[PDB]
Structure formats: structure tokens, C-alpha cells
Amino acid sequence: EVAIGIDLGTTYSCVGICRNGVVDIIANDQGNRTTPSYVAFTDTERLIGDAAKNQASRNPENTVFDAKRLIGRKFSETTVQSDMKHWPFTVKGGSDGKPMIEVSYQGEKKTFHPEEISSMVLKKMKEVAETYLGKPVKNAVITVPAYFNDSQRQATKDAGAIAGLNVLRIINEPTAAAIAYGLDKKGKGEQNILIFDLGGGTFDVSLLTLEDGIFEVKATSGDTHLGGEDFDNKLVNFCVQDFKKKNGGKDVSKNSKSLRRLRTQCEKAKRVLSSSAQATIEVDSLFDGIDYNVNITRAKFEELCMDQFRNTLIPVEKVLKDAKMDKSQVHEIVLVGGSTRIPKIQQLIKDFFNGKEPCKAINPDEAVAYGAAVQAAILSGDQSSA
Ligand SMILES: Nc1ncnc2c1ncn2[C@@H]1O[C@H](COP(=O)(O)OP(N)(=O)O)[C@@H](O)[C@H]1O
Ligand SMILES: [Cl-]
Ligand SMILES: [Cl-]
Ligand SMILES: [Cl-]
């Protein structure tokens, strides 16, 4: 009877519950309101979430992430050929054409389908909700990108069933974000909603229309390889070159462990730069026992990412063109995804929409789970959010 909403994200997942008209986003064991979509296998144990992401640089080969890029795809798809360059783990094609993720677990070679890896993330999110409620949870609404095809959606549903969840429904991520803000029950008249979703690995822009509680996805666009990880890479590339100028041409990029440790600190400094004017990137004994330290101003970060930030407007213009509508016709702009916390991105979107304030009251990396939790409560017969 208890139903949860789960945002099964590319890089982070989130679980919410809507009870008595109110939505609680549930913190995991480490107090984190989102959980990495990571699964790691060691000589002794299977780690999921924070523990898996935390040891990724020490166990790259057996730490799986990005299973959402493989779920419901045939291994031969060109997107798999292209994406696999970014994965330290091995992916091979099975006789059925499905991807098989290969890891070592307790000294043995193991293979998993993408939906098996995703089922472990879903099981962790289910357990996070169960620990909070103190009761077992069986029903869930799980979200997927609006462009996900039938195979990708069915494999996501199968991942839910493997995790022990009764999937009440698979719904679109942009629609879940709009439902979170009560835009389906506000005004009644026709509303054009733009969802601007910039996460860790992907960028999705969706233009929705809503007449009388009915959402329709009119147009979608974006870039499946533009996200926060790309802004971290701009900081990494700068630091690699800065280390060269400081230490007689020494190249950190030759050591993959040095790059991973540098990337971890680049991502931390980036987050700091969303609320501070400066941040320090520091890695003790980075390469050749040399300590690395640099100060990055928000202005320098904005400069390194200038083109990537500005180019987020290209898919915005594309959805408006496809839907045959002017930017002045957009009633609400909803910011979704952890990267929408970057002040420069918020300013670019606001200026594009002629000073219109975007809807960002809900923590952007929680809005999809928040909407899914609302839909899960409605599908369970609870009309309290209405
Ligand atoms: N305060 C912040 N400033 C800039 N970026 C931030 C941030 N808080 C989170 N992020 C970024 O959000 C991205 C994760 O986005 P999120 O919406 O949680 O994940 P996902 N699975 O939908 O891709 C990461 O690249 C992370 O660095
Ligand atoms: Cl419920
Ligand atoms: Cl409780
Ligand atoms: Cl929809």
C-alpha cells in the first residue's frame, strides 16, 4: 500500500514519499538526499551508492556506473560504441545482443545485464525508504527520460521488478518535474512549460503543454553528453596545464589515478563556486609525490565553461522552433538537475527568457523524485496532494 517515487538517474538517484499531501525526499545512511547510481564489486563485498562511488578511483575496473546509458540498448548500437570510451569497466555483447557488464567479485568473473545493475540501485533506494518508514515498501513510480524508447522503458520496469518493486507506472522525467511544482493543478488554462534539466552527464530540454491536468511532451532536445562532468573536465584540463607550468612540464594526465583524484577535487571546488566567489583545488602528492594547490575564481570557472554554458540555450531554441512557439509563450521554466545550481547558467536562462524567474524552489536534483512521489500517491488512491 505504501508507494514511493524514484528518480533513477544517470549519475544520482533520489527517492521520495508523498503522504498527506506533503512530499518528503528521503536521506540515505550517510545523510545524503541523493545516492550515486554506482555499484562496485570487491574481493569481499558488493557496494551500492556512496560506498561504491567513494572507492571508484581505487577499484576502477569493478565499479559500475552509467548503466542508464546501456539499459534497453543492443550492444551494437552506435551510442554504446561511442560511450564505452568513458568506462573503465568492461562491456561485451551477449549472444542475444544485450550488453554484459563484466566485473570481478570475490575473485570470480561475473557478468550483469544493465537492468541487473539498475535493479541494485533501485533496491538500495527501496531500502533507503524502508529504513526511514520502518516498514517494507512494494509499490513505486519510476521515471525515465522522455526520449526513452519502448525497450529502454521496459528494461527500466524489469529492473524495478528484479528489485522487488511493483512498478505502478513508468513516467517521463520532465513530466515528473512539472507535477512536483503543481503546474498540472494551477490556473486550468493552457500552459507551456519548459523543463531545463542539466545533470551530471546529460542535458535535456522538454517543452510541455498542460490543458486541464493533462501533460503532453510537445518537443524535446538536448545533449546526451553535456553535464556537470564536462565542467569538472574543464577544471581538470586547466589544472593539468597549470601543474605543467609549475613543475617543469610534468604531465599528470599520464597517470589515470592522478587524474581521478584531481577530478574529485575539481568537482568539489565547482560546487563551492555556486555559492562562493573563489575555491581552492588541492591534491596532496598528486603526481611524482608533488603536492598540487590552485585557487579558482568563479570568473575563471565561467571563462573555462563559457561556450558550454552559452550552448545550453541552443536546445532551448530548438524545442521552441519544433513546437512552433516564441519564448514569450513559455509560462514556467523549471530548473532540474544538480548543475542548474551554477549561477551563470541561471543568469543565461533568465536573460534568454527576458528576465523571467525560473522555478527553482525545489532542490533541482530532487524535483523528479518529488513529482514521481506525488504520482505514486495519486496512483495509490491518495488524493491529498490535489
Ligand atoms: N552546488 C552545485 N554546483 C554545481 N554543480 C552541482 C552542485 N550540486 C550538484 N552539482 C552537480 O550535479 C551533477 C549531478 O546532477 P544530478 O541532477 O544529481 O544527477 P543526474 N543522475 O540527474 O545526472 C554533478 O555533476 C554535480 O557536480
Ligand atoms: Cl503512498
Ligand atoms: Cl516516518
Ligand atoms: Cl507526459
* DSSP structure class, residue 263: H
Q: Of 123, 148, 142, 170, which Cα lies nearest the Cα of 69? A: 148
Number of Cβ within 10 Å of residue 319's Cβ equals 24
**Enclosing H/E stretch for 297:** strand 290-297
Query: Torsion over CA of 60, 62, 67 and 71, rounded to 10 degrees?
Result: 140
How would you label 279-306 residue by residue, b for 16+ Cβ within 10 Å and e otherwise? bebebeebbeeeebebebebebbbebbe
Q: Which residues contact 124 (CB under 8 A, 6 or more apart)?
A: 13, 28, 35, 48, 49
* DSSP structure class, residue 350: H
Q: Which ligand is nearest to the CA of 220?
A: 4
Q: Of 363, 347, 357, 360, which Cα lies nearest the Cα of 309? A: 347
Task: List Cα–Cα distances, 252 to 85, 257, 274, in angstroms.
Answer: 19, 9, 27
**How many CA atoms lie within 13 Å of 70's alpha carbon, on the beta-carbon side?**
30
Structural contact between residues 48 and 127, judged by C-beta atoms closer than 8 angstroms = no
What's the reported resolution, in angstroms, to a tenth? Answer: 2.1
Query: How many angstroms separate the CA atoms of 265 and 239, rounded?
Result: 11
Q: Of 312, 89, 46, which Cα lies nearest the Cα of 205? A: 312
Query: How many angstroms separate the CA atoms of 103 and 41, rounded?
Result: 7
Where are the strands (E) in 31-114, listed by range?
A: 35-36, 39-41, 46-48, 63-64, 90-93, 99-105, 108-112
- 173 annotated active-site: yes
Mutation pick for ligand 1 pocket among 8, 10, 12, 267 (CB with most ligand atoms within 8 Å): 12
Rg of the chain over all Cα atoms, to the nearest angstrom: 21
Q: Of 260, 86, 54, which Cα lies nearest the Cα of 252? A: 260
Query: How many angstroms separate the CA atoms of 10 and 14, rounded?
Result: 11
With 0-12 CB in 10 A as exposed, 13-18 as middle and 19+ as buried, what is 212?
A: exposed
**How many CA atoms lie within 13 Å of 242's alpha carbon, on the beta-carbon side?**
16
Phi-psi label, residue 168: left if phi above 0, alpha if psi -120 to 50, beta otherwise? alpha
Query: How many angstroms separate the CA atoms of 182 and 180, rounded?
Result: 6
- 232 annotated active-site: no
* Residues of each annotated binding site: 7, 11-12, 200, 267, 270, 338, 341
Task: List Cα–Cα distances, 242 to 245, 251, 284, 295, 358, in angstroms.
Answer: 5, 10, 15, 11, 37
- 127 annotated active-site: no
Query: How many angstroms separate the CA atoms of 111 and 70, rounded?
Result: 14
Cell triple for 41: 564489486
In the structure, which protein residues have their CB atom closer than 6 angstroms to any atom of ligand 1? Answer: 9-12, 34, 199-201, 227-229, 267, 270-271, 274, 337-339, 341-342, 365
Structural contact between residues 316 and 348, judged by C-beta atoms closer than 8 angstroms = no
Residue that the C-alpha cell 541552443 belongs to? 314
With 0-12 CB in 10 A as exposed, 13-18 as middle and 19+ as buried, what is 108?
A: exposed
Number of Cβ within 10 Å of residue 188's Cβ equals 10
Q: Which residues pair with 283 in a beta bridge?
A: 292
